[PDB]
């Protein structure tokens, strides 16, 4: 396959900044007919993709002049001179020259803000779940920025990789923060055979991890 | 006007065969150079190309899925079809119908997309969720609700029947069953005094549940 590597995968900006998304193909996009079928698509939250740019640097009908396309061979760039609000979304490069047709993984154009530390909360299984023989421990990491965050689960001091489920909200429209939810699901038996439960986050805002924990026996 | 419309079955199980219709208008597939195709996107994931069919019965396929795909047409009825044999969870995606020509004057690009059709591949029988309260641990407070193991989407979640929207974070469900969580952050004096209740509906199974979040006691 031809691979479309986009850089970066997340692009924070302010409205009115200039933005650039590199796209590089693993091999030439010049079709043998003469043309480079390199296109750019925008997908806004819960919408179908829309074509913005075709054959490297031809704007689609209706696309504003603040978008342009550049490059040749295996090295391409989309530029946005003044990011406007409606521009935020996910941007894909596409090559239509080789079979199979490929897209890049997508560049999120998202809103830049000040660094914000996660408010973290940990919760033991409900009596209700225990009554019913399940055992989940839930952790919430709300209102942080930027989006990258390492979250770790510890039982009695050993790391638990098994049976973790994570979920992220999209960038909050009101304050531009992200929030995350982490659930460790064990059997009641495994939960009753350990005592210390630690949700542990690492973020740009603290030099050392944020630790929330409890001891089962004291609930 | 050019329009494309996808129809699919919404839900189907593994091993089974996916039949998807597309119904266009504004152009004819009979036109020399004309072509119509399928592209998909798994939940919060990339864009994967599937297949294209040409006016003159010529066909292009994605190698990975070639042994599972069969694109066909009916130009007298303005319809393109695509079958995928032996589905599995993997294939859970949004499916798009797209128009693409191989001549310039006809539009060599993915300009036109349909709204797209959601296809969920799951083995699950309709299952009522299990709604669990999540009270803070011992010693602005944050409460939570865990909605666990339900099929299919969606569930509705509110705090005090909607009375409380400030500081709500509701996280997207993740899977054969879905699980969901929500956090609410209220001023430290509000709770436990004033009651706070988690209200959850799961239309598919006639589920409605109201869980009061109860403060932890010594017992």
């Amino acid at each position: 396959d031809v691979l479309m590597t986009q850089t970066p995968l997340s692009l924070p900006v302010s409205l009115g900044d200039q933005a650039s998304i590199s796209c590089r193909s693993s091999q030439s996009i010049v079709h043998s007919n003469g043309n480079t079928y390199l296109e750019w698509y925008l997908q806004k939250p819960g919408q179908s993709p829309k074509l913005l740019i075709y054959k490297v640097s031809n704007r689609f009908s209706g696309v504003p002049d603040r978008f342009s396309g550049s490059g040749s061979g295996t090295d391409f760039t989309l530029k946005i001179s003044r990011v406007e609000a409606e521009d935020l979304g996910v941007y894909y490069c596409f090559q239509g020259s080789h079979v199979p047709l490929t897209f890049g993984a997508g560049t999120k154009l998202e809103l830049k803000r000040a660094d914000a530390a996660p408010t973290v909360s940990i919760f033991p299984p409900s009596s209700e779940q225990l009554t019913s023989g399940g055992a989940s421990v839930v952790c919430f990491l709300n209102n942080f920025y930027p989006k990258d965050i390492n979250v770790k689960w510890k039982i009695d001091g050993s790391e638990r990789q098994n049976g973790v489920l994570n979920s992220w909200t999209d960038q909050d429209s009101k304050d531009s923060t992200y929030s995350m939810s982490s659930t460790l699901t064990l059997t009641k038996d495994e939960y009753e055979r350990h005592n210390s439960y630690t949700c542990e986050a690492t973020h740009k805002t603290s030099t050392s991890p944020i630790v929330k924990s409890f001891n089962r026996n004291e609930c | 006007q050019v329009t494309l419309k996808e129809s699919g079955p919404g839900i189907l199980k593994p091993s089974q065969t996916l039949s998807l219709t597309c119904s266009f208008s504004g152009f004819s597939l009979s036109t020399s150079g004309m072509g119509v195709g399928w592209i998909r996107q798994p939940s919060g994931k990339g864009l994967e190309w599937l297949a294209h069919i040409w006016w003159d019965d010529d066909r292009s396929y994605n190698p990975s899925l070639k042994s599972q795909l069969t694109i066909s047409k009916d130009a007298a009825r303005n319809q393109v079809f695509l079958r995928i044999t032996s589905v599995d969870t993997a294939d859970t995606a949004t499916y798009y119908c797209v128009r693409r020509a191989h001549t310039t004057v006809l539009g060599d690009w993915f300009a036109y997309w349909g709204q797209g059709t959601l296809v969920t591949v799951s083995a699950a029988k309709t299952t009522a969720p299990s709604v669990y309260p999540l009270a803070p641990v011992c010693g602005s407070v944050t409460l939570g609700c865990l909605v666990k193991g339900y099929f299919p989407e969606p569930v509705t979640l509110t705090w005090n029947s909607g009375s409380l929207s400030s500081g709500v974070h509701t996280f997207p469900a993740v899977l054969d069953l879905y699980t969901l969580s929500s956090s609410v952050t209220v001023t430290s004096s509000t709770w436990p005094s004033q009651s706070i209740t988690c209200n959850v509906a799961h239309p598919a199974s006639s589920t409605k549940v109201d869980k009061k979040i109860e403060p932890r006691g010594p017992t």
């Binding site: 007919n33 003469g34 020259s97 047709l101 | 001549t103």
Partner: peptide, 6 residues
């Protein structure tokens, strides 16, 4: 190659 005409 994918079908195209120039």
């Amino acid at each position: 190659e994918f079908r195209h005409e120039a």
